[PDB]
Design a protein around this nucleic acid. Sequence first.
DNA 1: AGATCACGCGCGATATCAGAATCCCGGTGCCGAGGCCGCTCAATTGGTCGTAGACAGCTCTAGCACCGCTTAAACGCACGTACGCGCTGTCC
Length: 96
Amino acid sequence: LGGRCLAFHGPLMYEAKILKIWDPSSKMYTSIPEEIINGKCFFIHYQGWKSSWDEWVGYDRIRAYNEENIAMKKRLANEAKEAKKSLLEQQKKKKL
DNA sequence: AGATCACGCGCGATATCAGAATCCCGGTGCCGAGGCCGCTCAATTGGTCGTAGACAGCTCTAGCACCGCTTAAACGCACGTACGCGCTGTCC
């Protein structure tokens, strides 16, 4: 509770802080979409964003705040920007 | 080669998907304002006396006015150069 974590949104990562941890067994959260209500999900406030973007995320969309996940986030950002540059270059080439 | 139609790209406008901040509407508790009461000090009433200001007469200084010359300064004109202003790009 309150620890730092990395969360999925699209093909990119975003640093977030856990505000609520949901325990489906006891039906309570320590301080919900049906597809994650059954399992242990977490309410997270994303670093660098407003409270309006706070959301519940399951285990699939979350990762521990470690070196490996930070590096994987950096790789995702790098491949995303590379893809955008490639798409722009392809459009430019198609234009001539 | 030129004109018309269709497709693609670029730009403008509206909408919108949102989400952000502000304004608004309602309930609530408050304390700040308006009011009444009592007391007293400052304003009003009455009177005096004296000097400050109002008024008339006179004086003469200064303001106004006028004229005429002469000549410093304003007005006018022209060339041009350098400063204002617009546009553009970069960096912070």
